[PDB]
C-alpha cells in the first residue's frame, strides 16, 4: 500500500503548506 | 521575518507533496 | 497587490490539489 | 483511470501553486 501511504503523506504535506500560507497572508495584511 | 519563513516552509511542504505524488503515480502504472 | 494575489491564487490551487487527492484516495480504496 | 487523472490534475495544481509562491517570495524580498 505504498500508493495509499504516499497519498496520505501528500495530503498531510499539503495541509501543512495551507496553514503556513494562511499565516503568510495574515502577515501581509498587516 | 515570519511571512518569508512561512512561504519557505510552504514551498518545502509542497516539494514533499510533489515527490510523494510522483511515487503514487508510478505505483498506479505498475 | 501582486504578493497578496499570488498567495490567494496559490491557496486556490492547493484547494484544487486537495480535492483531487481525496478523489484519488477513494479510488484506491475501491 | 479516474485515479490517474486525479493525480495528474493534482500535480498540475501543485505546479501552479509553486510558481505563484515563488512570485510571492520574490515580492517579499523587495
Ligand atoms: C504555524 C505553525 C506552523 C506553521 C505556521 C506558521 C506561522 C505560525 C504558526 C505557528 C506555529 C506552527 C508551528 C510550526 C509550523 C511550521 C511552519 C509554519 C509556518 C508559519 C509561520 C508562522 C509563524 C509563527 C506561527 C506559529 C509559531 C510557532 C508554531 C510552530 C513552530 C514551528 C512550526 C513550523 C515552522 C515554520 C513554519 C512556518 C514559519 C512561520 C514562522 C512563524 C513563526 C511563528 C511561530 C513559531 C513557531 C514554531 C516555529 C516553527 C517553524 C518556524 C517556521 C516558520 C516561522 C517560525 C516561527 C516560529 C517557528 C518558525
Ligand atoms: C505568474 C503567472 C501565474 C502566477 C504567477 C504569479 C505572478 C506573475 C506570473 C505572471 C504570469 C502568470 C500568469 C498567471 C498565473 C496566475 C497566478 C500566478 C500568481 C502570481 C502573481 C504574479 C503576478 C504577476 C506575474 C505574472 C503576470 C501575469 C502572468 C499570468 C497572468 C495570470 C495568471 C494567474 C493569475 C494570478 C496568479 C497569481 C497572481 C500574481 C499576480 C501578479 C500579476 C502578474 C502578472 C499578471 C499576469 C496574469 C494575471 C493572471 C492572474 C493574476 C493572478 C495574480 C496576479 C496577477 C497579475 C497578473 C495577473 C494576475
PDB file of C-alpha atoms and ligand atoms in Angstrom:
ATOM      1  CA  UNK A   1       0.000   0.000   0.000  1.00  0.00           C
ATOM      2  CA  UNK A   2       2.859   2.369  -0.850  1.00  0.00           C
ATOM      3  CA  UNK A   3       0.442   4.267  -3.113  1.00  0.00           C
ATOM      4  CA  UNK A   4      -2.020   4.839  -0.291  1.00  0.00           C
ATOM      5  CA  UNK A   5       0.731   5.819   2.104  1.00  0.00           C
ATOM      6  CA  UNK A   6       2.129   8.264  -0.461  1.00  0.00           C
ATOM      7  CA  UNK A   7      -1.228   9.977  -0.948  1.00  0.00           C
ATOM      8  CA  UNK A   8      -1.810  10.172   2.798  1.00  0.00           C
ATOM      9  CA  UNK A   9       1.627  11.752   3.190  1.00  0.00           C
ATOM     10  CA  UNK A  10       0.994  14.184   0.324  1.00  0.00           C
ATOM     11  CA  UNK A  11      -2.309  15.225   1.897  1.00  0.00           C
ATOM     12  CA  UNK A  12      -0.590  15.932   5.229  1.00  0.00           C
ATOM     13  CA  UNK A  13       2.134  17.947   3.468  1.00  0.00           C
ATOM     14  CA  UNK A  14      -0.492  19.977   1.611  1.00  0.00           C
ATOM     15  CA  UNK A  15      -2.259  20.628   4.929  1.00  0.00           C
ATOM     16  CA  UNK A  16       0.981  21.996   6.337  1.00  0.00           C
ATOM     17  CA  UNK A  17       1.520  24.177   3.267  1.00  0.00           C
ATOM     18  CA  UNK A  18      -2.025  25.536   3.596  1.00  0.00           C
ATOM     19  CA  UNK A  19      -1.679  26.543   7.220  1.00  0.00           C
ATOM     20  CA  UNK A  20       1.645  28.290   6.602  1.00  0.00           C
ATOM     21  CA  UNK A  21       0.116  30.094   3.599  1.00  0.00           C
ATOM     22  CA  UNK A  22      -2.694  31.418   5.825  1.00  0.00           C
ATOM     23  CA  UNK A  23      -0.081  32.740   8.280  1.00  0.00           C
ATOM     24  CA  UNK A  24       1.745  34.458   5.410  1.00  0.00           C
ATOM     25  CA  UNK A  25      -1.451  36.005   4.051  1.00  0.00           C
ATOM     26  CA  UNK A  26      -2.282  37.388   7.503  1.00  0.00           C
ATOM     27  CA  UNK A  27       1.270  38.749   7.832  1.00  0.00           C
ATOM     28  CA  UNK A  28       0.776  40.645   4.554  1.00  0.00           C
ATOM     29  CA  UNK A  29      -2.455  42.286   5.726  1.00  0.00           C
ATOM     30  CA  UNK A  30      -0.543  43.805   8.470  1.00  0.00           C
TER      31      UNK A  30
ATOM     32  CA  UNK B   1      10.648  37.530   9.150  1.00  0.00           C
ATOM     33  CA  UNK B   2       7.560  35.408   9.767  1.00  0.00           C
ATOM     34  CA  UNK B   3       5.994  35.872   6.305  1.00  0.00           C
ATOM     35  CA  UNK B   4       9.182  34.879   4.490  1.00  0.00           C
ATOM     36  CA  UNK B   5       9.685  31.916   6.788  1.00  0.00           C
ATOM     37  CA  UNK B   6       6.089  30.777   6.245  1.00  0.00           C
ATOM     38  CA  UNK B   7       6.487  30.878   2.483  1.00  0.00           C
ATOM     39  CA  UNK B   8       9.797  28.990   2.676  1.00  0.00           C
ATOM     40  CA  UNK B   9       8.189  26.286   4.813  1.00  0.00           C
ATOM     41  CA  UNK B  10       5.170  26.104   2.484  1.00  0.00           C
ATOM     42  CA  UNK B  11       7.449  25.643  -0.521  1.00  0.00           C
ATOM     43  CA  UNK B  12       9.316  22.792   1.228  1.00  0.00           C
ATOM     44  CA  UNK B  13       5.986  21.145   2.129  1.00  0.00           C
ATOM     45  CA  UNK B  14       4.800  21.445  -1.481  1.00  0.00           C
ATOM     46  CA  UNK B  15       8.071  19.843  -2.662  1.00  0.00           C
ATOM     47  CA  UNK B  16       7.409  16.906  -0.334  1.00  0.00           C
ATOM     48  CA  UNK B  17       3.833  16.572  -1.597  1.00  0.00           C
ATOM     49  CA  UNK B  18       5.113  16.580  -5.188  1.00  0.00           C
ATOM     50  CA  UNK B  19       7.655  13.838  -4.665  1.00  0.00           C
ATOM     51  CA  UNK B  20       5.130  11.618  -2.874  1.00  0.00           C
ATOM     52  CA  UNK B  21       2.621  12.265  -5.662  1.00  0.00           C
ATOM     53  CA  UNK B  22       5.203  11.068  -8.198  1.00  0.00           C
ATOM     54  CA  UNK B  23       5.741   7.855  -6.236  1.00  0.00           C
ATOM     55  CA  UNK B  24       1.960   7.355  -6.161  1.00  0.00           C
ATOM     56  CA  UNK B  25       1.613   7.951  -9.907  1.00  0.00           C
ATOM     57  CA  UNK B  26       4.308   5.351 -10.605  1.00  0.00           C
ATOM     58  CA  UNK B  27       2.647   2.906  -8.209  1.00  0.00           C
ATOM     59  CA  UNK B  28      -0.590   3.149 -10.237  1.00  0.00           C
ATOM     60  CA  UNK B  29       1.180   2.417 -13.535  1.00  0.00           C
ATOM     61  CA  UNK B  30       2.508  -0.831 -12.272  1.00  0.00           C
TER      62      UNK B  30
ATOM     63  CA  UNK C   1      -1.037  43.845  -4.690  1.00  0.00           C
ATOM     64  CA  UNK C   2       0.901  41.150  -6.534  1.00  0.00           C
ATOM     65  CA  UNK C   3       2.131  39.275  -3.432  1.00  0.00           C
ATOM     66  CA  UNK C   4      -1.353  39.030  -1.933  1.00  0.00           C
ATOM     67  CA  UNK C   5      -2.816  37.968  -5.255  1.00  0.00           C
ATOM     68  CA  UNK C   6      -0.129  35.300  -5.683  1.00  0.00           C
ATOM     69  CA  UNK C   7      -0.852  33.839  -2.267  1.00  0.00           C
ATOM     70  CA  UNK C   8      -4.607  33.858  -2.937  1.00  0.00           C
ATOM     71  CA  UNK C   9      -4.081  32.028  -6.229  1.00  0.00           C
ATOM     72  CA  UNK C  10      -1.699  29.543  -4.580  1.00  0.00           C
ATOM     73  CA  UNK C  11      -4.269  28.787  -1.885  1.00  0.00           C
ATOM     74  CA  UNK C  12      -6.969  28.144  -4.523  1.00  0.00           C
ATOM     75  CA  UNK C  13      -4.581  25.847  -6.430  1.00  0.00           C
ATOM     76  CA  UNK C  14      -3.779  23.938  -3.229  1.00  0.00           C
ATOM     77  CA  UNK C  15      -7.527  23.539  -2.559  1.00  0.00           C
ATOM     78  CA  UNK C  16      -7.930  22.016  -6.023  1.00  0.00           C
ATOM     79  CA  UNK C  17      -4.996  19.659  -5.446  1.00  0.00           C
ATOM     80  CA  UNK C  18      -6.532  18.580  -2.128  1.00  0.00           C
ATOM     81  CA  UNK C  19      -9.926  17.752  -3.560  1.00  0.00           C
ATOM     82  CA  UNK C  20      -8.407  15.754  -6.426  1.00  0.00           C
ATOM     83  CA  UNK C  21      -6.180  13.926  -3.939  1.00  0.00           C
ATOM     84  CA  UNK C  22      -9.284  12.936  -1.960  1.00  0.00           C
ATOM     85  CA  UNK C  23     -10.922  11.542  -5.096  1.00  0.00           C
ATOM     86  CA  UNK C  24      -7.729   9.576  -5.799  1.00  0.00           C
ATOM     87  CA  UNK C  25      -7.570   8.193  -2.254  1.00  0.00           C
ATOM     88  CA  UNK C  26     -11.173   6.988  -2.525  1.00  0.00           C
ATOM     89  CA  UNK C  27     -10.462   5.455  -5.935  1.00  0.00           C
ATOM     90  CA  UNK C  28      -7.670   3.346  -4.382  1.00  0.00           C
ATOM     91  CA  UNK C  29      -9.929   2.029  -1.607  1.00  0.00           C
ATOM     92  CA  UNK C  30     -12.368   0.625  -4.055  1.00  0.00           C
TER      93      UNK C  30
ATOM     94  CA  UNK D   1      -8.430   5.783 -14.801  1.00  0.00           C
ATOM     95  CA  UNK D   2     -10.082   8.467 -12.664  1.00  0.00           C
ATOM     96  CA  UNK D   3      -7.349   7.897 -10.062  1.00  0.00           C
ATOM     97  CA  UNK D   4      -4.588   8.579 -12.564  1.00  0.00           C
ATOM     98  CA  UNK D   5      -6.383  11.605 -13.939  1.00  0.00           C
ATOM     99  CA  UNK D   6      -6.876  12.948 -10.408  1.00  0.00           C
ATOM    100  CA  UNK D   7      -3.184  12.639  -9.563  1.00  0.00           C
ATOM    101  CA  UNK D   8      -2.173  14.246 -12.851  1.00  0.00           C
ATOM    102  CA  UNK D   9      -4.545  17.122 -12.107  1.00  0.00           C
ATOM    103  CA  UNK D  10      -3.253  17.455  -8.536  1.00  0.00           C
ATOM    104  CA  UNK D  11       0.328  17.579  -9.813  1.00  0.00           C
ATOM    105  CA  UNK D  12      -0.555  20.378 -12.252  1.00  0.00           C
ATOM    106  CA  UNK D  13      -2.335  22.313  -9.484  1.00  0.00           C
ATOM    107  CA  UNK D  14       0.686  21.942  -7.204  1.00  0.00           C
ATOM    108  CA  UNK D  15       2.911  23.207 -10.034  1.00  0.00           C
ATOM    109  CA  UNK D  16       0.734  26.295 -10.306  1.00  0.00           C
ATOM    110  CA  UNK D  17       0.845  26.837  -6.543  1.00  0.00           C
ATOM    111  CA  UNK D  18       4.644  26.543  -6.601  1.00  0.00           C
ATOM    112  CA  UNK D  19       5.154  29.124  -9.310  1.00  0.00           C
ATOM    113  CA  UNK D  20       2.845  31.625  -7.610  1.00  0.00           C
ATOM    114  CA  UNK D  21       4.660  31.022  -4.301  1.00  0.00           C
ATOM    115  CA  UNK D  22       7.989  31.875  -5.973  1.00  0.00           C
ATOM    116  CA  UNK D  23       6.470  35.136  -7.260  1.00  0.00           C
ATOM    117  CA  UNK D  24       5.249  35.954  -3.744  1.00  0.00           C
ATOM    118  CA  UNK D  25       8.632  35.188  -2.186  1.00  0.00           C
ATOM    119  CA  UNK D  26      10.341  37.485  -4.700  1.00  0.00           C
ATOM    120  CA  UNK D  27       7.765  40.211  -3.988  1.00  0.00           C
ATOM    121  CA  UNK D  28       8.660  39.996  -0.282  1.00  0.00           C
ATOM    122  CA  UNK D  29      12.388  40.437  -0.923  1.00  0.00           C
ATOM    123  CA  UNK D  30      11.613  43.686  -2.452  1.00  0.00           C
TER     124      UNK D  30
HETATM  125  C1  LIG E   1       2.284  27.915  12.253  1.00  0.00           C
HETATM  126  C2  LIG E   1       2.739  26.664  12.642  1.00  0.00           C
HETATM  127  C3  LIG E   1       3.435  26.081  11.553  1.00  0.00           C
HETATM  128  C4  LIG E   1       3.416  26.997  10.516  1.00  0.00           C
HETATM  129  C5  LIG E   1       2.709  28.132  10.937  1.00  0.00           C
HETATM  130  C6  LIG E   1       3.148  29.480  10.513  1.00  0.00           C
HETATM  131  C7  LIG E   1       3.164  30.579  11.461  1.00  0.00           C
HETATM  132  C8  LIG E   1       2.762  30.370  12.783  1.00  0.00           C
HETATM  133  C9  LIG E   1       2.310  29.019  13.199  1.00  0.00           C
HETATM  134  C10 LIG E   1       2.765  28.814  14.459  1.00  0.00           C
HETATM  135  C11 LIG E   1       3.214  27.526  14.861  1.00  0.00           C
HETATM  136  C12 LIG E   1       3.209  26.459  13.926  1.00  0.00           C
HETATM  137  C13 LIG E   1       4.346  25.692  14.145  1.00  0.00           C
HETATM  138  C14 LIG E   1       5.018  25.093  13.084  1.00  0.00           C
HETATM  139  C15 LIG E   1       4.574  25.288  11.778  1.00  0.00           C
HETATM  140  C16 LIG E   1       5.698  25.431  10.936  1.00  0.00           C
HETATM  141  C17 LIG E   1       5.659  26.343   9.914  1.00  0.00           C
HETATM  142  C18 LIG E   1       4.539  27.150   9.679  1.00  0.00           C
HETATM  143  C19 LIG E   1       4.960  28.480   9.239  1.00  0.00           C
HETATM  144  C20 LIG E   1       4.258  29.624   9.664  1.00  0.00           C
HETATM  145  C21 LIG E   1       4.967  30.750  10.078  1.00  0.00           C
HETATM  146  C22 LIG E   1       4.280  31.341  11.203  1.00  0.00           C
HETATM  147  C23 LIG E   1       4.991  31.911  12.233  1.00  0.00           C
HETATM  148  C24 LIG E   1       4.603  31.691  13.525  1.00  0.00           C
HETATM  149  C25 LIG E   1       3.468  30.914  13.789  1.00  0.00           C
HETATM  150  C26 LIG E   1       3.490  29.965  14.860  1.00  0.00           C
HETATM  151  C27 LIG E   1       4.639  29.831  15.610  1.00  0.00           C
HETATM  152  C28 LIG E   1       5.079  28.574  16.002  1.00  0.00           C
HETATM  153  C29 LIG E   1       4.343  27.409  15.624  1.00  0.00           C
HETATM  154  C30 LIG E   1       5.070  26.284  15.208  1.00  0.00           C
HETATM  155  C31 LIG E   1       6.528  26.277  15.165  1.00  0.00           C
HETATM  156  C32 LIG E   1       7.183  25.695  14.089  1.00  0.00           C
HETATM  157  C33 LIG E   1       6.443  25.109  13.039  1.00  0.00           C
HETATM  158  C34 LIG E   1       6.841  25.298  11.696  1.00  0.00           C
HETATM  159  C35 LIG E   1       7.968  26.129  11.421  1.00  0.00           C
HETATM  160  C36 LIG E   1       7.933  27.031  10.397  1.00  0.00           C
HETATM  161  C37 LIG E   1       6.788  27.159   9.634  1.00  0.00           C
HETATM  162  C38 LIG E   1       6.326  28.466   9.214  1.00  0.00           C
HETATM  163  C39 LIG E   1       7.044  29.617   9.591  1.00  0.00           C
HETATM  164  C40 LIG E   1       6.370  30.758  10.041  1.00  0.00           C
HETATM  165  C41 LIG E   1       7.098  31.328  11.097  1.00  0.00           C
HETATM  166  C42 LIG E   1       6.449  31.936  12.198  1.00  0.00           C
HETATM  167  C43 LIG E   1       6.914  31.728  13.497  1.00  0.00           C
HETATM  168  C44 LIG E   1       5.789  31.573  14.329  1.00  0.00           C
HETATM  169  C45 LIG E   1       5.820  30.653  15.332  1.00  0.00           C
HETATM  170  C46 LIG E   1       6.964  29.884  15.582  1.00  0.00           C
HETATM  171  C47 LIG E   1       6.529  28.580  15.988  1.00  0.00           C
HETATM  172  C48 LIG E   1       7.262  27.433  15.566  1.00  0.00           C
HETATM  173  C49 LIG E   1       8.359  27.568  14.706  1.00  0.00           C
HETATM  174  C50 LIG E   1       8.352  26.504  13.792  1.00  0.00           C
HETATM  175  C51 LIG E   1       8.713  26.726  12.489  1.00  0.00           C
HETATM  176  C52 LIG E   1       9.146  28.028  12.067  1.00  0.00           C
HETATM  177  C53 LIG E   1       8.694  28.235  10.799  1.00  0.00           C
HETATM  178  C54 LIG E   1       8.258  29.484  10.406  1.00  0.00           C
HETATM  179  C55 LIG E   1       8.271  30.527  11.311  1.00  0.00           C
HETATM  180  C56 LIG E   1       8.711  30.315  12.573  1.00  0.00           C
HETATM  181  C57 LIG E   1       8.038  30.926  13.704  1.00  0.00           C
HETATM  182  C58 LIG E   1       8.083  30.024  14.750  1.00  0.00           C
HETATM  183  C59 LIG E   1       8.781  28.851  14.297  1.00  0.00           C
HETATM  184  C60 LIG E   1       9.164  29.062  12.959  1.00  0.00           C
HETATM  185  C1  LIG E   2       2.723  34.170 -12.708  1.00  0.00           C
HETATM  186  C2  LIG E   2       1.824  33.561 -13.571  1.00  0.00           C
HETATM  187  C3  LIG E   2       0.834  32.907 -12.797  1.00  0.00           C
HETATM  188  C4  LIG E   2       1.127  33.144 -11.466  1.00  0.00           C
HETATM  189  C5  LIG E   2       2.291  33.923 -11.400  1.00  0.00           C
HETATM  190  C6  LIG E   2       2.425  34.972 -10.365  1.00  0.00           C
HETATM  191  C7  LIG E   2       2.980  36.270 -10.703  1.00  0.00           C
HETATM  192  C8  LIG E   2       3.396  36.536 -12.010  1.00  0.00           C
HETATM  193  C9  LIG E   2       3.272  35.475 -13.041  1.00  0.00           C
HETATM  194  C10 LIG E   2       2.913  36.081 -14.199  1.00  0.00           C
HETATM  195  C11 LIG E   2       2.005  35.446 -15.090  1.00  0.00           C
HETATM  196  C12 LIG E   2       1.454  34.184 -14.748  1.00  0.00           C
HETATM  197  C13 LIG E   2       0.130  34.167 -15.167  1.00  0.00           C
HETATM  198  C14 LIG E   2      -0.843  33.502 -14.428  1.00  0.00           C
HETATM  199  C15 LIG E   2      -0.504  32.873 -13.233  1.00  0.00           C
HETATM  200  C16 LIG E   2      -1.544  33.081 -12.302  1.00  0.00           C
HETATM  201  C17 LIG E   2      -1.231  33.313 -10.988  1.00  0.00           C
HETATM  202  C18 LIG E   2       0.093  33.362 -10.535  1.00  0.00           C
HETATM  203  C19 LIG E   2       0.233  34.382  -9.496  1.00  0.00           C
HETATM  204  C20 LIG E   2       1.396  35.172  -9.428  1.00  0.00           C
HETATM  205  C21 LIG E   2       1.283  36.543  -9.206  1.00  0.00           C
HETATM  206  C22 LIG E   2       2.274  37.224 -10.007  1.00  0.00           C
HETATM  207  C23 LIG E   2       1.989  38.440 -10.582  1.00  0.00           C
HETATM  208  C24 LIG E   2       2.384  38.690 -11.866  1.00  0.00           C
HETATM  209  C25 LIG E   2       3.102  37.719 -12.576  1.00  0.00           C
HETATM  210  C26 LIG E   2       2.795  37.473 -13.952  1.00  0.00           C
HETATM  211  C27 LIG E   2       1.787  38.196 -14.551  1.00  0.00           C
HETATM  212  C28 LIG E   2       0.899  37.578 -15.421  1.00  0.00           C
HETATM  213  C29 LIG E   2       1.023  36.182 -15.696  1.00  0.00           C
HETATM  214  C30 LIG E   2      -0.153  35.421 -15.760  1.00  0.00           C
HETATM  215  C31 LIG E   2      -1.471  36.017 -15.567  1.00  0.00           C
HETATM  216  C32 LIG E   2      -2.423  35.351 -14.809  1.00  0.00           C
HETATM  217  C33 LIG E   2      -2.122  34.100 -14.227  1.00  0.00           C
HETATM  218  C34 LIG E   2      -2.545  33.807 -12.911  1.00  0.00           C
HETATM  219  C35 LIG E   2      -3.233  34.813 -12.167  1.00  0.00           C
HETATM  220  C36 LIG E   2      -2.929  35.039 -10.856  1.00  0.00           C
HETATM  221  C37 LIG E   2      -1.929  34.305 -10.247  1.00  0.00           C
HETATM  222  C38 LIG E   2      -1.003  34.941  -9.333  1.00  0.00           C
HETATM  223  C39 LIG E   2      -1.118  36.318  -9.065  1.00  0.00           C
HETATM  224  C40 LIG E   2       0.022  37.129  -9.018  1.00  0.00           C
HETATM  225  C41 LIG E   2      -0.276  38.365  -9.614  1.00  0.00           C
HETATM  226  C42 LIG E   2       0.686  39.065 -10.382  1.00  0.00           C
HETATM  227  C43 LIG E   2       0.320  39.690 -11.574  1.00  0.00           C
HETATM  228  C44 LIG E   2       1.356  39.468 -12.503  1.00  0.00           C
HETATM  229  C45 LIG E   2       1.045  39.216 -13.803  1.00  0.00           C
HETATM  230  C46 LIG E   2      -0.283  39.215 -14.250  1.00  0.00           C
HETATM  231  C47 LIG E   2      -0.403  38.193 -15.249  1.00  0.00           C
HETATM  232  C48 LIG E   2      -1.595  37.416 -15.317  1.00  0.00           C
HETATM  233  C49 LIG E   2      -2.616  37.598 -14.376  1.00  0.00           C
HETATM  234  C50 LIG E   2      -3.162  36.347 -14.052  1.00  0.00           C
HETATM  235  C51 LIG E   2      -3.533  36.082 -12.760  1.00  0.00           C
HETATM  236  C52 LIG E   2      -3.414  37.093 -11.748  1.00  0.00           C
HETATM  237  C53 LIG E   2      -3.057  36.487 -10.583  1.00  0.00           C
HETATM  238  C54 LIG E   2      -2.177  37.101  -9.715  1.00  0.00           C
HETATM  239  C55 LIG E   2      -1.647  38.334 -10.040  1.00  0.00           C
HETATM  240  C56 LIG E   2      -1.995  38.928 -11.204  1.00  0.00           C
HETATM  241  C57 LIG E   2      -1.008  39.635 -12.000  1.00  0.00           C
HETATM  242  C58 LIG E   2      -1.319  39.423 -13.329  1.00  0.00           C
HETATM  243  C59 LIG E   2      -2.494  38.596 -13.386  1.00  0.00           C
HETATM  244  C60 LIG E   2      -2.894  38.316 -12.066  1.00  0.00           C
END
